[PDB]
Amino acid sequence: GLFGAIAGFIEGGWTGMVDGWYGYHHQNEQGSGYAADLKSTQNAIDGITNKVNSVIEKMNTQFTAVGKEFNHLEKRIENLNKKVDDGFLDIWTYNAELLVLLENERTLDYHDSNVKNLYEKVRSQLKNNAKEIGNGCFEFYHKCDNTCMESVKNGTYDYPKYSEEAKLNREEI
């Protein structure tokens, strides 16, 4: 992708995550499970909502009619009517197809950036208390219970709390 997160170091997605678009998977002594990140998912949904609304809101319904047919004398104007309808038809078809193709790639890249920032927020939070094992995973060098797991997700994580606990395991190897 453009940001290298989706189909990048994270090769595949989670089918078990059915509560949000982006989230975490934890594995501690108490148990394991999926949990979506609320901040990233809700903002993304509103952003894509605004993107879709930005396209279709102005495209309002029009009153149409067959109109008067053209007699033999009304040939030149009939050709002009064909010219304008075809001209608008060609322009609208080209613009609609082009906009969808361009915006779809931007939409895909939007998810790529949202996933990447989530990984960086965790990566910057943990710092040396975890190991980057790849595929978006973080092997903790210390003991992380459920409270510790949620602290990273809520953004209220404390590096000094497990600094010495991890450091002993870092210097172990």
């Binding site: 009619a65 067959v66 109109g67 047919e69």
Partner: protein, 55 residues
């Protein structure tokens, strides 16, 4: 004696008009006229159109 269609060399050009409520239609002629028999009181609605389809 123009080229006859439907085995009639004679022709009949059809005209129409909408007489406004409260108006006369003076039909004056000396010959070669086809007079109306049935009229149509009506109130138009919008443009709409004619769908030339066999659906």
């Amino acid at each position: 004696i123009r080229p006859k269609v439907r085995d009639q060399e004679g022709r009949m050009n059809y005209y129409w008009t909408l007489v406004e409520p409260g108006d006369k239609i003076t039909f004056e002629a000396t010959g070669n006229l086809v007079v109306p028999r049935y009229a149509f009181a009506m109130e138009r609605n919008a443009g709409s159109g004619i769908i030339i389809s066999d659906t």
